[PDB]
């Protein structure tokens, strides 16, 4: 049971597990898709993955994480942009569907929510205790890490540039 | 470990408990609330509840609910009215901010989840699983069932009227 600190704005929030960091394996890890299927890492192994988690799309900072990465996931490689979060998938599909964006994945937390403390995302205190934090992390086509950011303000967006491979 | 059966048009679906009936105390819950602070049946000690409980709001015949209610709620004498769901706060405030539905309270199981099962509500199988069923429970001030309905068809809306005190 290991902890790290992030911030809502500035505040101190405890994040349970650690991050996957450079050089481990990712665990597998199944969500739910915008049909209902439950959906697993392991199915798209040999793409390499974006993994954007963050709070609530529905939420500012979110959203803006979304609309970049969908736009920034067409002048990219062999590669699946994967948006995962605490929503709901109707939500998911609701943002995605009045933003018209249609490259990126939507993954709910809805079934699978040990991801969480498995990627060292579940908030377990204050007001955010039940949501992910905002994180990003990259993995290669057999789920290696290959990049992965923790963000300290929650506030802030990631950094998408940057790091990117 | 009882269960009850509900249908996704036709199609059996495994709902974990059994709903609070008419005499019974119901349980004590705490869930979360628009601004996420945690809000609890016993804050509305003295008034009366209806609880409207809906897959998502987000979803067709979930939405008409909450609206429906809270156009029902301003014609209601000494009564709160909580739409309580799934959905993260964010969406169900979304909801309500876009529809300009002031009248109901949010209430989502981000945190509390043990509600559903608590309440009869859990659903523990199918593509719907990690959800809560549809229902209405109707309590007094001191959280006695005065009236309580389990929707056989998740499709079709509960019957408001009929049964309303």
Redesign the interface.
Known sequence: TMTQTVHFQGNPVSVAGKLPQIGDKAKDFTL?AK???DVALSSFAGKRKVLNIFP?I??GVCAASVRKFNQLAGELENTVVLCIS???P??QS?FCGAEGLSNVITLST??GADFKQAYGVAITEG?????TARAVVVLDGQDNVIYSELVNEITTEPNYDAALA
Not at 127 to 131: D, E, F, I, K, Q
């Open positions: 739910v049909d209902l299927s609530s529905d939420t605490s929503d709901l109707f939500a609701r809805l079934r007001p955010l205790a039940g949501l």
